[PDB]
């Protein structure tokens, strides 16, 4: 019999040898209990509902609370939100004159001098023009929420976290893979702890995900209703590489008592923005299979893909993180295909702007600074799922666009199987 309860978190036998207690907390006292056993059971059928389930809010609340409480003992950045007089008189590259190089401020530093002229390098989207002349600039985030530097001890990777139910409770993941997560399923594989779910945050795409059963599938609410958020899982994993080619200089400006703030020095090497590569043949075959299976859901009219509309930076870009740096890739040309009703060559590339200061989450709360790192950075992963969203017009073309509009749609793609009884 189903009920409402609160679960716990577990981990594997991997432990932090650097002993970063703060992020070690993810597995600091969480028991490893690495004994995953499976069982099979028969005579169970029931209307499963992945949209109205119980533990996705549990996952979202603990992920956001872990991200908030991982930064409390770290340094507070608060005395840096001051006037920024940024000049940009010289130009090693033409795209640097808009509020990037030698952006100087009058800072009272550690040595008790009130007006030291100290400069830094910043990104033009991360800065805003103050209401007046163009000679002064302001940080886009300290207007809204308090900014906080990230410590070196909170350097994060996706740990394949495990959920275990307490005594007197059980969890059921239905074996049927074709199950759309909305309706009567069949014979039940029963475990006490699920397989690993990595807490990766992403928009419009699923990276380092879980593969399918052998062919792609389309899941959502019952077709009887007007489905909007459609999560598409794929059987053919597609490699994605995203890289930045510039070595960077890391400088130290002391603003806290006895601790350090790290800022960006000069760019070393030939300067370009971030760029990502997708194999054209696998992408074309992937979209062909997605269209040819999505046709039987709506077997009357044409379907098409469109890039996302505006409103903020996250919906307009593919947003992810690699190496402690946040990447916003355009991805507009990847969804311009249109279809009709009734193995790696000529690779496609996409631009990708990088970010330093993120608004992060909990606007009743704090916000993040990301310190820079040196060296050319390559980040390779596999894409598994899509987060397209449906709209319908008066014409015979059903439009789709990457989206979803919630982080809970990211967790719900892998947590659809489980409910508590």
């Amino acid at each position, epitope marked *: 019999k189903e009920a409402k309860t609160t679960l716990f978190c577990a981990s594997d036998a991997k432990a932090y040898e650097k002993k970063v207690h703060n992020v070690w907390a993810t597995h600091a006292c969480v028991p490893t209990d690495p004994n995953p056993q499976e069982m099979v059971l028969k005579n169970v059928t029931e209307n499963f509902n992945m949209w109205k389930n119980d533990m996705v809010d549990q996952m979202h609340e603990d992920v956001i609370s872990l991200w908030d409480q991982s930064l409390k003992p770290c340094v507070k950045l608060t005395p840096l939100c001051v006037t920024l007089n940024c000049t940009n008189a010289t130009a090693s590259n033409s795209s640097i004159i808009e509020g990037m190089k030698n952006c100087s401020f009058n800072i009272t530093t550690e040595l008790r001098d009130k007006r030291e002229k100290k400069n830094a390098l910043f990104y033009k989207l991360d800065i805003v023009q103050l209401d007046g002349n163009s000679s002064q600039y302001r940080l886009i985030n300290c207007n809204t929420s308090v900014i906080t530097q990230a410590c070196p001890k909170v350097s994060f990777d996706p740990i394949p976290i495990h959920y275990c139910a307490p005594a007197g409770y059980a969890i059921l993941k239905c074996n049927n893979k074709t199950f759309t997560g909305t309706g009567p399923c069949n014979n039940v594989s029963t475990v006490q702890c699920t397989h690993g779910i990595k807490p990766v945050v992403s928009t419009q795409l699923l990276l380092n995900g879980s593969l399918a059963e052998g062919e792609i599938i389309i899941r959502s609410e019952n077709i009887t209703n*007007n489905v909007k958020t459609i999560i598409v899982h794929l059987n053919e994993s597609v490699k994605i590489e995203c890289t930045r080619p510039n070595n960077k200089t890391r400088t130290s400006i002391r603003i806290g008592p006895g601790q350090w703030f790290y800022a960006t020095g000069q760019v070393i090497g030939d300067i370009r923005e971030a760029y990502c590569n997708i194999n054209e043949s696998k992408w074309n075959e992937t979209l062909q299979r997605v269209s040819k299976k999505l046709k039987e859901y709506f077997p009357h009219k044409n379907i098409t893909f469109q890039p996302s509309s505006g409103g903020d930076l*996250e919906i307009t870009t593919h947003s992810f993180n690699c190496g402690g740096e946040f990447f916003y890739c355009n991805t507009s040309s990847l969804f311009n295909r249109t279809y009709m009703a009734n193995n790696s060559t000529r690779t496609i590339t996409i631009h990708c702007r990088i970010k330093q200061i993120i608004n992060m989450w909990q606007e009743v709360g704090r916000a993040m600074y990301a310190p820079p790192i040196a060296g050319n950075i390559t980040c390779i992963s596999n894409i598994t799922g899509l987060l397209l969203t449906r709209d*319908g017009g008066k014409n015979n073309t059903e439009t789709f666009r990457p989206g979803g509009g919630n982080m809970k749609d990211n967790w719900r793609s892998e947590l659809y199987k489980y409910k508590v009884v």
Partner: antibody
Amino acid sequence: QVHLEQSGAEVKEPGSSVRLSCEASGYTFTDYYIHWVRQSPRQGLEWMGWINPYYGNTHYAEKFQGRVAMTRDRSTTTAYMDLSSLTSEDTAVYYCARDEGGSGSYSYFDSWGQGVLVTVSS
Amino acid sequence: DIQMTQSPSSLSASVGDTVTITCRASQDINNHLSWYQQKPGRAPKALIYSASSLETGVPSRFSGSGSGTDYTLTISSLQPEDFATYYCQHYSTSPYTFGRGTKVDIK
């Protein structure tokens, strides 16, 4: 126990804009959508548009494209609407709407606010 | 665009009897339909949705039926605070469109 609250309004001039604000309480604000509707004599209940409160993406009406602007604010949990370039037919009462089936299949909206008159005069 | 028509704006009724109200659509709106009960001076509330399933707190006096391009609502043994106007709204697709509304009045 979900509640929508919006305040009063006063007279504005044609060719100008108007500011409308609504706030939500009871249920978590980031999990459904916010709709805007309009009531007036001699007209029906014309649809204005809908807004995702978590993200910035919106959807508009083809009759009212360019004359309206939308804004979410998750800090104060508010929805902001800006009708611009007023015309004498727009003297009407305006209503907010909380939708259901959040991030699923949006079907019918139930929770409505008080609704506020706005009148344009030169 | 999707255009609806309804019954004429005035329906004769008496307390504790049956009232049949209907509205017709022009295209395929499947069962994506809902109704609202508009009282003057007050923001209306949904009472029936998807032509079959009622909302909690709303009694069994309002029975919805129909399919395709015409939909009916039957009111059996009505009480005096159902003497207000009724609107029918489709939610098939596109920008939405509302009905014109019919009032329930005593002869």
